[model samples]
Every structure is written in structure tokens, then in C-alpha cells.
Target: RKIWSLIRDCSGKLEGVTETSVLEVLLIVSRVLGIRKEDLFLKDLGVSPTEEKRILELVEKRASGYPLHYILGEKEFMGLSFLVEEGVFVPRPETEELVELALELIRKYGIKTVADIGTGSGAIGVSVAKFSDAIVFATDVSSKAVEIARKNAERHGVSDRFFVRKGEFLEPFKEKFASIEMILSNPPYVKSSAHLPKDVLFEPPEALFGGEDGLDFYREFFGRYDTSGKIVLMEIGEDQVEELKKIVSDTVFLKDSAGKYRFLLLNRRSS
Candidate 1:
């Protein structure tokens, strides 16, 4: 009696996947709990009373716009596992290219210290630290991301090299700024008026919007920071290159595998 009707007219906020895939994941959950998948079709029948209750909650969460990755509580990045929570950022596949580039810079330049500005969920910093000898000072403006980021750093056994701080860009590492060799960010560049996929709205603004035209942070950053002898790497909004030319002194724009100018590499020409 109590089965699939919860999604019959469920919230329209579910971001991706269709009804069938939703039900399929429910079955996967049942299997994880040692219940037969076929039984769910019968009436939560193939599972115990407790199992039935648990499955219902999962469907409810999915229906409510909770991201599948958040429900799973973890995600894979750079071939490593990291924890993600409801309020923090979830690492995406595209961001992996940023980490790969960071590792490459570390290896080539003998870079030793890095600051991951606006470090959400510690994805960029932790991943770089795991793959290189760099000691990463990761900063985030959101308090929620602070503990979760630290947890991920510990989970990856990079806690010794990963330091999490709660603050805005560049503020956390000021005392040691001169020693920091690089600055990396997958910062908030989504336009304030931009329409995000339904589930994306659930993530924090601290991790999302940049400003009116999505160039606020970049303008503020490029205008304020002294980049004389440092390397700066960042993922950028697709249509943002023109504004970048106005703000940053000089940069090497690189395309992702999809052939979009997806990253900005500023290897400053000064000593």
C-alpha cells in the first residue's frame, strides 16, 4: 500500500534522472541492505518493515531536491574519496582537470606551498596536497564547509598538509603569504541572475554566485592581490574571458576536454 505514490506528484525540484532511475536507486539501496531487489516491486514486500521505512525516507529526500551525491555523503575526485554534506560543495568531474593542472605546476615548478582560496569541501586543495608535496592552506567563507573540509582532509590522510580556515579569499594565509607559491580557486562565478538546475540551488551561495554579471570576485581579486611572482589557477565561467582580459594583467587561457576555454592560468612574468 505504501510504495511509489510519494513521487507520483513529488516536488519538481529533483534535478536529474527520471522516475525509473529514482526507483532503480531505491532498489540499489535495498540490495545494500541485503534485501532482494525484486521484492520492492511487489510492495516493499521483499524487504522487512524497517527496510521499507528506510527506503521511503530515501525517496522523500530525493524528491525534495537533495542531491544524490549529498544523500550518498561522499564523492570521488582525482581518484580519491571525499566527504560532502548538505550545505557544502560537491566536487564535479570537470573540476578534476583543475587539480590535474595544479599537480603539474607543483611538479614542474618545485612549488612547496599553496593557498586554495574559497576552498569548498576542500576539493581543490586536498586533492592537490594528496598528489604533491605542497602544504595547502585552504580557506572558505562558509563555516559549514570548514569542518566538512577538515573531515575530508583527514579522510584522505592529508590532514597533516591540509589546513582549513573559515574566512574569505586570501585572508586565512596572510601571515605566510610570501612563502605561498600558488593560489588556486574554483570560485563562485555563477551569475546572480543565472538560472541554476533545481538541485544546485540547495548548495550555499558562499559556493555559488559571484555577483551581478558573475565577475565581482574576479574584479575584486585581480584589483587587490599582488601577483608579482605567483602562479594563479582558476576555473572560470564560459562566457567570462572578455572581462578577465580587463581585470587580470596576463593569463594563459586553457580549454577543457570539451574544448571550452574553461580555465585561467596566470603564471606571472615577474620575479
Candidate 2:
């Protein structure tokens, strides 16, 4: 009874989130509290009084604009669970498009070696390994994020096939980390002046800001990673893909499922 009241009260206040957010939050709450939706639906079934009190506390946290995934301490990406921390930028849905692009490249070229820079939760690296037979190495500027990403790889039984490192952009791989068939990243694309919401600001600054034009990382990546027989698949926001294509100058555009300017498809020219 108290838990139900708490859910109702909190649901009324979350105007920032939609019906889908409400449902997602509720499911997260149930999962955290060990209360299944079916159990809650059964008449006369109620959480223990102690657990009901706990629900109100968590609900209060949610009402304060805390993300449900952060509260649950994990998120599912590419059908796998990843350990997400407060400082790491949570994986976005559109990034799955980047994963698909990598898969297509792998299948088409029979290429295997792949590197993912700024791999926050190792979502792209893990998904590529799962979908394609690729040996993936993921690098992040944050050691904490690298640790979490590695653990996520272990959890999914791909740790043997996946590697994690701490580096800025692609700097750590100057001489090593090897040639790759494809390099993929949903790098930070938020311009400093962009009106990012408070929730976005909560993530690590390195994971969001990409210089003034939001193209600094892409420029750095292309100059460093573009080599013969190498293909690059990157995710960018609106108004970015065109400018980014000019920077690469050797790449083409590929639309995601939504038909938006999604990924920069690049292949290095060989003699």
C-alpha cells in the first residue's frame, strides 16, 4: 500500500520523463526490490512493511531526477548487462547503429581486429565481439571506466576476446594496438555551448564535450587511425556527419535504420 502510494506520488512529478520512462523506472524499482510485476499484480500481495518503507526512499531519489539505471547500478546494452558508474556517460540507443555498422564491415571484408576508443561501458566492443568474430580492444581516458568495461566483458564471457586500456583518444595506441579492419566509437560530440540537460552534465566531462564544434575527437581519430585497408565507422549527431566527412575526405556516408545521417563509412586507399 505504501509502495503503491509512493509510485503514484513520484510518477506525478516526473514530467521530464515520458510514460516509457515511468514504466522503465517502475520495472527497475521492482527488480531492485526483488518484487516481480506479477507478484505486485496479485490481489492481496503486498511488499513487506520494511520493504515498502525502502521503496519510498528509492522513489524519493527518483523524484529528484536521478536516473533509474544509476540507481539500479547497471544497464543492458546490446542484450548484455554493463556496469555503469556515475561518472561514465551511459550508452545511448543510437550507438547501436555504430555496432551494426561495424558488424556489416566485418561480414563484408572478413576483417577481424577492431579497436573502440572512449569505450565507456564496452558496449560497442562487446557487441562487435558477440555479433562478429572479432578480437576487440577498448580504450578509455578514464581508468575507472576501463575497469568497469573490462568487468562487463568478463561478465559476458568475452574478456578473453576483449581488451581494455586507458588512453586519450587514440594516443595510447601510437605504435601498438595494431592495425584494425574497423575502428568504431560514439565519441563525445557535445559542444561546450550546447544546452545539455542537467542529467547529461552528470556524466564525465570527457565523455560529453568534444571541443567547440564537437568534431575535435573525430579529427584526432581520423588523422591517427586512417591507414590503408582500415575502415572507420563512427557515430555522430545531426549537422556533424557532413563536416566530419570533409575532415576524413576519404569516407562515405551510411544511414542508420532511421535514415538519418548516422555513421561515417571510411576505407583507406591502398596502392
Candidate 3:
């Protein structure tokens, strides 16, 4: 009752509620009651008082902390739907800017090979492959993540070009890794001590943490990769542009729709 009451009055400013949540509750209730979100307020779908009560319970959970993407079992990335089972990191919208930056780089340079390091949910790798059907490899440290990434690859019908490899960064692929035309990654950058919201805490910790200051993975990538034949696109924390640029030395900041430096564009510096 309080949720709907809040929806009725302060629907526009509920704390801890994302716009996605509001749409979610409306959609789920509509599904259960056999109505559409647009039709929910217009006409009742033979919803009994008991059913209405049940919906309130569900809404309360969402308002409390449950992520709607998990509840719905899928997330959309780069305009493509990806299955998001538990333990897999949910794809964030900001990461699409990473994809856009990559695609732009690929097209501008007419590159054909790509690698996505730490490709959780295969969002970056799959998006790049789908955009151009380029030969692509998606790497993840977790074998389980590789499975999830594979599933995401199939989701977009780009599975033929998107293959998941199990390895930490580019290590296992040593000699082969340096030859990719480009590389992209939205590796973990959240500080270990950063307090996570309940829903975010539900995501895999390995996919979220980046040592104490949230720069470990990037540091490892730059130090290890030869970068001789590669252009790299990387997504970093919301506030890490300066620090990340410092580590990379010559990265170009790629802004998101929010005007934040959401990614870094780089090419190997010549010797």
C-alpha cells in the first residue's frame, strides 16, 4: 500500500528506486494480472484483492534492494539482450560507451581482429562482433564467466565470431594476444573498500573489485600486453579518468552520454 501510495504521490522521487524499477514493478504486475504497463492504471485485469496484495509484496522487495534486471533474468546491452544469471555481473549502460568507442576505433582504422579482456556477460566482445562480424575473443578469469559469456554470444547470433577464452587478462594467450587488431575491456574498477548498494553487492566480487585503489587490472594489462599491434578501449570507474590516464600515459578519454570520461582509447606507442 505504501509503495503504490508513494507511486501515486511521490512517484517521481522515491529513494533507492531506479527508473528501471518503476518500469519493472509495472511490468511484472501487468504480467501477473494479464495487463500491459500502459494499461495498468487504465483498466484492471481481473486482479483480485489478494493478487493486488501479492504485487505489493513484490514491489516492496524491489524498493528495498532487489535488482530488476536479475528479477527479470536479462539485461540489455548495446541494444542487445543478454541473459544475466546469478553470479554474473550485470551489464551497465555506461559500458555501452566502451562499445561505441571501440566500434568507432575499429571503423576508423578498418580493423578486423578484436579481443575483450575480462569480458563479463560478453557485453563488449559480443557488441563489437555484432557490429561488424569481426573475429573476436572474449576472455574471463572465471570458467563460469566464460560460459555466461558464451551464452551471451549466442544471444546476439554473433556466436560464430565471438569465442570465450578462459584466462586472466591476456596471459594464457601470450604470443597470440599481441596480434589482435584491437582490445577492449570493462574490467572491475570498484575499490575494495567502497560500500556497495545491496543489489550491486549481489554481483560477483571478482567482477567488481580492483585492489585497494581500483587500478590493479589496468595496471596489469598495460604492463603485460605488448600492445604492438593493438588499439585498446577500456572502461574505468566514474572518477578514475585522471588516474587511469596517468597509468596509461597516452590514453584518450572517451566520454559517455553522461559527459563523464567513461572509457579510454589507446593505441600502442611506437618504439
Best prediction by lDDT? 1
Tens digit of per-residue lDDT, candidate 2, span 1-271:
5456555665666656555655655775586578665665653434566767676676666666676777777787877778887877788788887887678778877877898888998889988887777898789999888988888888888988888889886677666445666678888887977955653445778888889998898877667654666777788877786687578786788777877887777777243
Model 1: how far is 121 from its true place, Å? 1.0
Worst 10 residues of 3 by lDDT: 6-15
Off-target runs (Cα >4 Å) in candidate 3 are 1-16, 19-21, 30-42, 46-57, 196-200, 269-271
Clashing pairs in 1: none
Candidate 2 segments whose C-alpha is farther than 4 A from its true place: 37-39, 175-178, 196-200, 269-271
- Report the candidate with higher lDDT, 1 versus 3: 1
lDDT of 3 by residue, 1-271 (tens): 3335433433333345775545666665664566655766643224567767666666666676666666666788888988887778899888877788778777777787888889878888888898885788778988778998898888788878988888898766666665678888889998887964543566788998999989999988888766765788888888898788778887788677877777777887243
What TM-score fits each model?
0.85, 0.89, 0.82
TM-score of 3: 0.82
Q: Please identify which of the two predictions, 1 or 2, would achieve the higher lDDT against the true structure.
A: 1
User: What ranges in model 1 sit over 4 Å off?
Assistant: 1-46, 196-200, 269-271
Q: Per-residue lDDT tens digits of candidate 1, residues 1-271?
A: 2445533323232335454655546543654456554655664423456765665577567765566677667777888878888898898899999999989988888899999988878889999888898999988888888888899999989999999888888877789788888999999998988964553577887688888889888888887889878999999999999888888857889999999988999997354
Tell me the lDDT of model 1 at 181. 83
Candidate No. with top TM-score: 2
Return the TM-score for candidate 2, rounded to 2 decimals: 0.89
